[PDB]
Ligand binder design. Structure first.
Ligand SMILES: CCCCCCCCCCCCCCCCCC(=O)OC[C@H](CO[C@@H]1O[C@H](CO[C@H]2O[C@H](CO)[C@H](O)[C@H](O)[C@H]2O)[C@H](O)[C@H](O)[C@H]1O)OC(=O)CCCCCCCCCCCCCCCCC
Ligand code: CLA
Ligand code: CLA
Ligand code: CLA
Ligand code: CLA
Ligand code: CLA
Ligand code: CLA
Ligand SMILES: C=Cc1c(C)c2cc3nc(c4c5[nH]c(cc6nc(cc1[nH]2)C(C)=C6CC)c(C)c5C(=O)[C@@H]4C(=O)OC)[C@@H](CCC(=O)OC/C=C(\C)CCC[C@H](C)CCC[C@H](C)CCCC(C)C)[C@@H]3C
Ligand SMILES: CC1=C(/C=C/C(C)=C/C=C/C(C)=C/C=C/C=C(C)/C=C/C=C(C)/C=C/C2=C(C)CCCC2(C)C)C(C)(C)CCC1
Ligand SMILES: CCCCCCCCCCCCO[C@@H]1O[C@H](CO)[C@@H](O[C@H]2O[C@H](CO)[C@@H](O)[C@H](O)[C@H]2O)[C@H](O)[C@H]1O
Ligand SMILES: CCCCCCCCCCCCO[C@@H]1O[C@H](CO)[C@@H](O[C@H]2O[C@H](CO)[C@@H](O)[C@H](O)[C@H]2O)[C@H](O)[C@H]1O
Ligand code: OEC
Ligand SMILES: [Cl-]
Lengths: 447, 32, 340, 35, 137, 335, 82
């Protein structure tokens, strides 16, 4: 049916731009690979998982995702039951077979096109309505999902709240922030130091609350598109084609990819330092904690200690007056964390609490996190580039963040590429300048 | 004295830029 | 006459053209490549640099290398049958005979190859600008792997053949010669960096300024291997750049000559800079800067900063990097900032 | 056509082909040396 | 140039008596030392307090003496300050505090002996490297 | 008036402008004029900047003792970190020039405009009926400025760790980088140099092959260039003679005969390589550094047998141990 | 577009080819393998065995210090059971 007199081999999948049916097998077969992975990897992680040892010290990145939703863990991120892990893993792994079946089926047996084998499923790219509608269906499926989380947290068990009053623990959220003024406030937050935008979310109420809003707002738009067609501008503005639509979704993922990179790198809440590693700033903070703690025991008055530059070996002031840790760590004075907060006063680190309220669990927390900063090599040798071999470790936060910046990036190229193609395809010149009517040749010389 | 020399050459390169962009030889087709 | 028969045979059009040049090229080119591949996996650099340097010892593709000879050897050609090795092969290996082997052989191999271009050019009847161009890489190899160490104490300070073993050559040059601050190295990079730009930029300008000569999307097939019309709108390209950059080509003959010039000139300059580093005639400091830094302790530029980085590189490396000097730097003498 | 066997191309191909495999064999063996 | 049983002969107790480890214990210690120490004691130093190292001499002047299997072993069970005038099991991994330092839960007397042996054997092989820091890398 | 705004949009978008001020241009032209104008003044007259937040001003402008090679525009303070520092955030300019305010005003406007510059490289191609993608080639060098001016700082927690705007200031960025990340030992940088070396290489190959196989139409004492007229129908060189020579240098199937496949390769190589180099800096911005083979090969007793990888570590320690003399107060460099 | 040589494609497909190389290729492989595994390579290249970098006690390097009497000096380094 389709061969070189369609597209070139290495652009093969573009030969499916107009075979709805087969183009469905792909998406159903692909969606299989993701479940397969998710499932197959979880079991791989669990197969190697050692209960009495930090998750971040085991190259885990899925078990910690489950742990956050309050599963198999308890006080301080202590692993209680590995069953929920095994479950989530096998279930996915199975569903991968189910989906994979459909994919293979729709791509090599079933109808090569859909429009005729059922007009409901068959579709037309330029069919502004079918499009607005299918989009509408998916906008609801995703919306239900957003609530599927709100449920697990409020009814089915909770989530891992590291800020837990009694100290990190699985907690049931029964008071989601629904106040729009606050929820949407986040979107109006600067993305720079301090005000961190979305990534500044720091308590589960907002997380849960906000997801409540998204679920509804999302399904609402799902119905709205089901029941409509793009207006006028919406039409005189966009390009309506198979590629153009792709592109738009490409640029969309890219952006979400960058936002994700920063979330796992900066956020403490939805990414508990207990399962992942300590954050970049969190670790630099802990070094200051550790040594202010040490030397203070040797009889040093941290409050008045003067360092080489005359700035304050242990404590100094930020640009707006607050008391922070000194040293290069002055750049991370925006770090907040369960272990360190009880030392903060209304003006920042309180010299009295630091002087006699430091608790042992904090001293060892600071020590732990200090010696587990997110520094490591490709071959997984934890530490600074000049370090010695021995401690095989690279923070999950480093792995996640890099992988996703690469993907996020290439996708932005993907966007540019597929969008550039769509605009030339539409107007129609994505295959060359018309030897005959060469546009440039009809334009006045600027010379 | 040095500052002046550095800025001068710079100022000269920018002048060049101008003339190069706006005072090139109009690029003529076929009959050249 | 046999000569013309010998010729006849050589200049015969095979799969892999031999030619008179080949009589020099292939023997060498293969020996050079061979010696490397040999040492990389079998010979060590223990008796030479106190370093493991082959797969057989545990090195991976990055850490392996054919290390230079001892500093004792000096500039000795280190011939298999010379005063050093004395005909013995294994000793030769342990004294780094394999370095001058790869070096000197590959050297002739670059001569042979350029000659080849010259010979094949002549036969096929085309202009030799492919040979002129290749002078650039010769210069680099010649000045760096030969002229340089010829100015130093011995072959020991020439770049050792290997991946990592080359990175230290880089770090060394920063630390000891403050090479990055050299006008010639800069031109060098301006050319290589600028050359890799023309490359990319011209390529894209062509692929996105093409005429349609086919009905397919994959426009590759739509090309006439047999000349005729220009395959891309040279006229459109001109207008594009003339409006986005302000300047734009308009004489493919020049646009292409320019592409030969930029990177070949760059490498030539980077060579001269090194020919000067041989005598240690480096571009290390700016005297006016040093004088002000001496009298005034609060004057600080990104330059002074760098020089301190060099001091550290030299002090912390010199010991295991120049074994023949039996350096011993007490912990208290080692330059270091606070805490680190 | 009636193509020959031992040709110039063949020689070359082996000068690189033969040693290579001999090395890949050597190296493959090193993966087991220890201490 | 090898790890002879001659090198694996390290002091067992304070009264001169010695014990001889085996290439199995050694490797095993080395593995355990990585599992529960490297984190902070990589290469014989101490990241969260660079003033105290694992150099045998340092352990010799410790109080009580911690430069023999018996010593280090006690330490891994009930840790103290260099003068021994204060127990630190609360902020230093040890058996009496495995609830706080899980990595120490598995650890059995067999394991503690290996880790201890490693500490006395390493400097024997590496020498100055073991104690010092980056200066010796 | 057919309608002012209707007209405006026709001018902006006009393909008859000497310089195509596009839609993207409307953002570009201003941001780029600010970046450029602020830079030039800074570089010439700005006063010392406390780059490391330790009250130890680094003067990098001509009028304050620098020359073209040393001079630079210094990065915002470390006291500032990633915080936004617009002029209206300072009690005074004196305060703004001391904390390295100019740096941000410049990097932000530049990065902004240089992106639109890409957006424009698309637009004009559209208004002219030519295929897009050129702008995608320019995504590589841009994706680098981004990596070196923004990603790395975001990753490291401060703009003071972004690459300075000056010659020597850049060498500083490099030398230190190497020490903290051992970049030379990272796959992505290597791919980077392959692309750059390769590019220059290929740039020379093409350049010569073509120039050497030009059809004669010029005198013996006449510039061989005149043999070409702007707006020619047929080609100016024998791409069949070119391929004929190059195919014999190496061997036929290892040589291009399709000008389109030649030029795709010519563009693909450097752009792909630089893409990786940019991803390298953007990746080592989260501390996933190069291979660490320190003390890998050890002998039968346990002794450490050095490799060139170790000689590299010493050179790195020298850099580590000496950079930022007075900025560190603790053991580990986690920032 | 052609020269005398028999089009690789044909050869890499000829059952004769494999009938020959299924023997030849693994042949060469097993040879080199043995070259390493029999310790022969170590002697052909004077490369130290894991237990031959230093003498038991010594921690010094066998650095060759003078060209002409180098070979002689190297031999002595092997002496101290290095
Ligand atoms: C050509 C190719 C082009 C390539 C372009 C790539 C662009 C990638 C940029 C990522 C998008 C930024 C979105 C984001 O996630 O934005 C969020 C990030 C991260 O913001 C962070 O926000 C805060 C994080 O708080 C959290 O982190 C902890 C401290 O470490 C505390 O514990 C705290 O409780 C916890 O809530 C802190 O202020 C951090 O220091 C930091 O500023 O923004 C930042 O740094 C980014 C700085 C702003 C520039 C972005 C402009 C975009 C247009
Ligand atoms: C959202 C996902 C997405 C989707 C659905 C598409 C879909 C499509 N793309 Mg786009 N693309 C994307 C993202 C996406 N792309 C991104 C992020 C980029 C930037 C790099 C591109 C760049 C791109 C280009 C440059 C081209 C397309 C083309 C096409 C069309 C044909 C497909 C094809 O050529 O397959 C054939 C696929 C291959 C030959 C596979 C190449 C393999 C990759 C490069 C290796 C990745 C490495 C891997 C991770 C390593 C594993 C190790 C290995 C040893 C096993 C198709 C409509 C083509 C077209 O004609 O345009 C309309 C085309 O030329 N795409
Ligand atoms: C994309 C996200 C992602 C992330 C963040 C991780 C993260 C992690 N993985 Mg997982 N993994 C993934 C996807 C991912 N993985 C997939 C898709 C698979 C199936 C193949 C696996 C299979 C897998 C296994 C089997 C294992 C891990 C392990 C690990 C952990 C150790 C990392 C490591 O050792 O890397 C080392 C890896 C590299 C240095 C490879 C870099 C490769 C890059 C992407 C290639 C760049 C080339 C480019 C594409 C070339 C194209 C150019 C051309 C077109 C011109 C780490 C937590 C390990 C673990 O759990 O042990 C503790 C482990 O054993 N992973
Ligand atoms: C994400 C993965 C992916 C997916 C889902 C598809 C999907 C598809 N491709 Mg694309 N393709 C891909 C990657 C992918 N491709 C890549 C990387 C390249 C570049 C090398 C191409 C190049 C390409 C070309 C050149 C062409 C396609 C075509 C097609 C379509 C027809 C399928 C076909 O020809 O079967 C042929 C059938 C077989 C020979 C059988 C293969 C075996 C099956 C599919 C796998 C069984 C899987 C598993 C082992 C069993 C599960 C069983 C269990 C559930 C019980 C189909 C929509 C064709 C098209 O345009 O459609 C008309 C076409 O011409 N593709
Ligand atoms: C991506 C989603 C997807 C989509 C859109 C389609 C679409 C289509 N399929 Mg395929 N299919 C899929 C996945 C999908 N399939 C998978 C994974 C498999 C493997 C099991 C198959 C196996 C398959 C077969 C064997 C056949 C089709 C056929 C068809 C076509 C006829 C319609 C039909 O079967 O109605 C079926 C009837 C319904 C409308 C009821 C479905 C309701 C189920 C029980 C619930 C699903 C629940 C869902 C998971 C949750 C959403 C709820 C949420 C909103 C709250 C249609 C084009 C037929 C065909 O080729 O004819 C042209 C056919 O014979 N499909
Ligand atoms: C993600 C899924 C999704 C998708 C793909 C679409 C897609 C579409 N929507 Mg729907 N919509 C959705 C979800 C979705 N919608 C939901 C959940 C709701 C309920 C709130 C709506 C409500 C909705 C309405 C009320 C309308 C649409 C319309 C449209 C169409 C044109 C939109 C447009 O021109 O935007 C481009 C818009 C602009 C010119 C404004 C650019 C300014 C943005 C908002 C700010 C700058 C962005 C910045 C980069 C982001 C940073 C974050 C910020 C908070 C600071 C398009 C088909 C329109 C239509 O035609 O209806 C049928 C329309 O009137 N949608
Ligand atoms: C034809 C190409 C060729 C060339 C140019 C070279 C060149 C070189 N080889 Mg290589 N070599 C080659 C092929 C080639 N080789 C091949 C195929 C092999 C594998 C067998 C080798 C194996 C090899 C080894 C094992 C060694 C070299 C070495 C060398 C270098 C110095 C050797 C020397 O002093 O020669 C002197 C030159 C001549 C013998 C030419 C004499 C020519 C005249 C016309 C003949 C007169 C002869 C007559 C008897 C004299 C009358 C005078 C009377 C007073 C006695 C030199 C760079 C050495 C090295 O690399 O050192 C570090 C080394 O050890 N080569
Ligand atoms: C480091 C990067 C770099 C490499 C690896 C490289 C490589 C090559 N360039 C060639 C050509 C060219 N390069 C050119 C311009 C440039 N080339 C550049 C940069 C490079 N060029 C730059 C920057 C330019 C612009 C000035 C031109 C104009 C040409 C050509 O015409 C030619 C070609 O054919 O194009 C494809 C090929 C010549 C082959 C040959 O002579 O075989 C025969 C000789 C042999 C095999 C002897 C090798 C001997 C050397 C001296 C010893 C090396 C030692 C070991 C074998 C190598 C391992 C060591 C490393 C790990 C460090 C070769 C593939
Ligand atoms: C179309 C196409 C394609 C694609 C494909 C795809 C995409 C596929 C998929 C597929 C899939 C997606 C599949 C899946 C499957 C699955 C399965 C088959 C599963 C199973 C499972 C199980 C069995 C489980 C269980 C268990 C447990 C629970 C535990 C223990 C162990 C075990 C494992 C046993 C290609 C490219 C080739 C080509 C062209 C065409
Ligand atoms: C291309 C456009 C060119 C026109 C633009 C205007 C450029 C003007 C640049 C300033 C040139 C003068 O720059 C200035 O020169 C004088 C010497 O003459 C230097 O010397 C100055 O400091 C020294 C002490 O260090 C004093 O003893 C001296 O009296 C004082 O003039 C200044 O430190 C330098 O800043
Ligand atoms: C063009 C020039 C190409 C020259 C290639 C020469 C290659 C062979 O070079 C030759 O190698 C043999 C060893 O195999 C050396 O022979 C050496 O070792 C053998 C034992 O193996 C001793 O008996 C001999 O007395 C000693 O000199 C020769 O002294 C050397 O001259
Ligand atoms: Mn500019 Ca990265 Mn070395 Mn901590 Mn500062
Ligand atoms: Cl510095």
């Amino acid at each position: 049916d389709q061969e070189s007199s369609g597209f070139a081999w290495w652009a093969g999948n573009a030969r499916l731009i107009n075979l709805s049916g087969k183009l469905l097998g792909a998406h159903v077969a692909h969606a299989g690979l993701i479940v397969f992975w998710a499932g197959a990897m979880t079991l791989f992680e669990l197969a190697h998982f050692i209960p009495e040892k930090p998750m971040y010290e085991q190259g885990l990145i899925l078990i910690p995702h489950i742990a956050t939703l309050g599963w198999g863990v308890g006080p301080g991120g202590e692993v209680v039951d590995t069953f929920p892990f095994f479950v989530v893993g096998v279930v996915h792994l199975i569903s991968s077979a189910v989906l994979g079946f459909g994919g293979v089926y729709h791509a090599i047996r079933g109808p090569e096109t859909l429009e005729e084998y059922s007009s409901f499923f068959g579709y037309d790219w330029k069919d502004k309505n079918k499009m607005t509608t299918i989009l509408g269906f998916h906008l609801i499926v995703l919306g239900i999902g957003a609530l599927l989380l709100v449920a697990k947290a409020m009814f089915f068990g909770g989530l891992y709240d590291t800020w837990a009053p009694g100290g990190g623990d699985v907690r049931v959220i029964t008071n989601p922030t629904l106040d729009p003024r606050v929820i949407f406030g986040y979107l109006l937050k600067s993305p720079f130091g301090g005000e961190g935008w979305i990534v500044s979310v720091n308590n589960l109420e907002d997380v849960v609350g906000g997801h409540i809003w998204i679920g509804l707002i999302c399904i609402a738009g799902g119905i709205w598109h089901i029941l409509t067609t793009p207006f006028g501008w919406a039409r005189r503005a966009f390009i309506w084609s198979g590629e153009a639509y792709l592109s738009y979704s490409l640029g969309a993922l890219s952006m979400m990819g960058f936002i994700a990179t920063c979330f796992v790198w900066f956020n403490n809440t939805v990414y508990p330092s207990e399962f992942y590693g300590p954050t970049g700033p969190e670790a630099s903070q802990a070094q200051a904690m550790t040594f202010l703690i040490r030397d203070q025991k040797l009889g040093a008055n941290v409050g008045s200690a003067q360092g080489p530059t005359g700035l304050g070996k242990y404590l100094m002031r930020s640009p707006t007056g607050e008391i922070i840790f000194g040293g290069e760590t002055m750049r991370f004075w925006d770090f907040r964390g369960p272990w360190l907060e009880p030392l903060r006063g209304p003006n920042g680190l309180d010299l009295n609490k630091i002087k006699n309220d430091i608790q042992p669990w904090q001293e060892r927390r600071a020590a732990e996190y200090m010696t587990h900063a997110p520094l490591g090599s490709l071959n997984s040798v934890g530490g600074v580039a000049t370090e010695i071999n021995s401690v095989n470790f690279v923070s999950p936060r480093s792995w996640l963040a890099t992988s996703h910046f690469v993907l996020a990036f290439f996708f932005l190229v993907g966007h540019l590429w597929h969008a550039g193609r769509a605009r030339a395809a539409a107007a129609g010149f994505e295959k060359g300048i018309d030897r005959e009517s060469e546009p440039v040749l009809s334009m006045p010389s600027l010379d | 004295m040095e500052t002046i020399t550095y800025v001068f050459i710079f100022a000269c390169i920018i002048a060049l830029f101008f003339f190069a962009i706006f005072f090139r030889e109009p690029p003529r087709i076929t009959k050249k | 006459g046999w000569f013309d028969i010998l010729d006849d045979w050589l200049k015969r059009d095979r799969f892999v053209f031999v030619g008179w040049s080949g009589i020099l090229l292939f023997p060498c080119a293969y020996l050079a490549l061979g010696g490397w591949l040999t040492g990389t996996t079998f010979v060590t650099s223990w008796y030479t640099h106190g370093l493991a340097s082959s797969y057989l010892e545990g090195c991976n593709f990055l850490t392996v290398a054919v290390s230079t000879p001892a500093n004792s050897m000096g500039h000795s050609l280190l011939l298999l049958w010379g005063p050093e090795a004395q005909g013995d092969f294994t000793r030769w290996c342990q004294l780094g005979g394999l370095w001058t082997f790869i070096a000197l052989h590959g050297a002739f191999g670059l001569i042979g190859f350029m000659l080849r271009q010259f010979e094949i050019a002549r036969l096929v009847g085309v202009r030799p600008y492919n040979a002129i161009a290749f002078s650039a890489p010769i210069a680099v190899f010649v000045s760096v792997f030969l002229i340089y160490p010829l100015g130093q104490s011995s072959w020991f300070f020439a770049p050792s053949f290997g991946v990592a073993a080359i990175f230290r050559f880089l770090l060394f040059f920063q630390g000891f010669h403050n090479w990055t601050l050299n006008p010639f190295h800069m031109m060098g990079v301006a050319g290589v960096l600028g050359g890799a730009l023309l490359c990319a930029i011209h390529g894209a300008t062509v692929e996105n300024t093409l005429f349609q000569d086919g009905e397919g999307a994959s426009t590759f097939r739509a090309f006439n291997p047999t000349q005729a019309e220009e395959t891309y709108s040279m006229v459109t390209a001109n207008r594009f750049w003339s409006q986005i950059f302000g300047i734009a080509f308009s004489n493919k003959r020049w646009l292409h000559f320019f592409m030969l010039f930029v990177p070949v000139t760059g490498l030539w300059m980077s060579a001269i800079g090194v020919v000067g580093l041989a005598l240690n005639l480096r571009s290390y400091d700016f005297i006016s800067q040093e004088i002000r830094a001496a009298e005034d302790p609060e004057f600080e530029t990104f330059y002074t900063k760098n020089l301190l980085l060099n001091e550290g590189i030299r002090a912390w490396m010199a010991p295991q990097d120049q074994p023949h000097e039996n350096f011993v730097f007490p912990e208290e003498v080692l330059p270091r900032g606070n805490a680190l | 056509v009636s193509y020959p066997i031992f040709t110039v191309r063949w020689v070359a191909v082996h000068t690189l082909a033969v040693p290579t495999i001999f090395f890949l064999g050597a190296i493959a063996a090193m993966q087991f040396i220890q201490r | 140039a090898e790890l002879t049983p001659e090198v694996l002969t390290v002091p067992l107790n304070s009264e001169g008596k010695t014990i001889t480890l085996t290439e199995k214990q050694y490797l095993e210690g080395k593995r355990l030392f990585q599992y529960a120490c490297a984190s902070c004691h990589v290469g014989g130093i101490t990241k969260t307090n660079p003033s105290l190292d694992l150099r045998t001499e340092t352990l010799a002047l410790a109080t009580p003496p911690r430069d023999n299997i018996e010593g280090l072993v006690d330490y891994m069970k009930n840790p103290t300050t260099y003068d021994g005038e204060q127990e630190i099991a609360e902020v230093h991994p040890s058996l009496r505090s495995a609830d706080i330092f899980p990595k120490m839960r598995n650890l059995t007397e067999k394991d503690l002996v290996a880790i201890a042996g490693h500490i006395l054997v390493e400097p024997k092989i590496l020498g100055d490297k073991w104690g010092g820091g980056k200066v010796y890398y | 008036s057919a309608n002012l705004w209707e007209r405006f949009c026709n001018w902006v978008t006009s393909t008859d402008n000497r310089l195509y001020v596009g839609w993207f241009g409307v953002i570009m032209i201003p941001t780029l004029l600010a970046a450029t104008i602020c830079f030039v003044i800074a570089f010439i007259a700005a006063p010392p900047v406390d780059i490391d937040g330790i009250r130890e001003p680094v003067s990098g402008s001509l009028l304050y003792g620098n020359n073209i090679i040393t001079g630079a525009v210094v990065p915002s303070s470390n006291a500032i970190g990633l915080h936004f520092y617009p002029i209206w955030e300072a009690a005074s300019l004196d305060e703004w020039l001391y904390n390295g305010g100019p740096y941000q005003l410049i990097i932000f406007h530049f990065l902004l405009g240089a992106s639109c510059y890409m957006g424009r490289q698309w637009e004009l191609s559209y208004r002219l009926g030519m295929r897009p993608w050129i702008c995608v080639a320019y995504s590589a060098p841009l994706a680098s400025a981004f990596a070196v001016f923004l990603i790395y700082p975001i990753g490291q927690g401060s703009f003071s760790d972004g690459m300075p705007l000056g010659i020597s200031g850049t060498f500083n960025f490099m030398i230190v980088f190497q020490a903290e990340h051992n970049i030379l030992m990272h796959p992505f940088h290597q791919l980077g140099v392959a692309g750059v070396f390769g590019g220059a290489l290929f740039c020379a190959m093409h350049g010569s092959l073509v120039t050497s196989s030009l059809i004669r139409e010029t005198t013996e004492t006449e510039s061989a260039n005149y043999g070409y007229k702007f707006g020619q129908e047929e080609e100016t060189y024998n791409i069949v003679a070119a391929h004929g020579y190059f195919g014999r240098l190496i061997f036929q199937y290892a040589s291009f005969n399709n000008s389109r496949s030649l030029h795709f390769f010519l563009a693909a190589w450097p752009v792909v390589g630089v893409w990786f180099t940019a991803l390298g800096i953007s990746t080592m911005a989260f501390n996933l550094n190069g291979f660490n083979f320190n003390h890998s090969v050890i002998d039968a007793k346990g002794n450490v047998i050095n490799t060139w990888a170790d000689i590299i570590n010493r050179a790195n320690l020298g850099m580590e141990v000496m950079h930022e003399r007075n900025a560190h107060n603790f053991p580990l460099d986690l920032a | 577009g052609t020269t005398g040589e028999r089009p690789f494609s044909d050869i890499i497909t000829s059952v004769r080819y494999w009938v020959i190389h299924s023997i030849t290729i693994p042949a060469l492989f097993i040879a080199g393998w043995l070259f390493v595994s029999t310790g022969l390579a170590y002697d052909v290249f004077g490369t130290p065995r894991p237990d031959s970098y230093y003498a038991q006690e010594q921690r010094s390097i066998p650095l060759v210090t003078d060209r002409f009497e180098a070979k002689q000096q190297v031999e002595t380094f092997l002496e101290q059971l290095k």
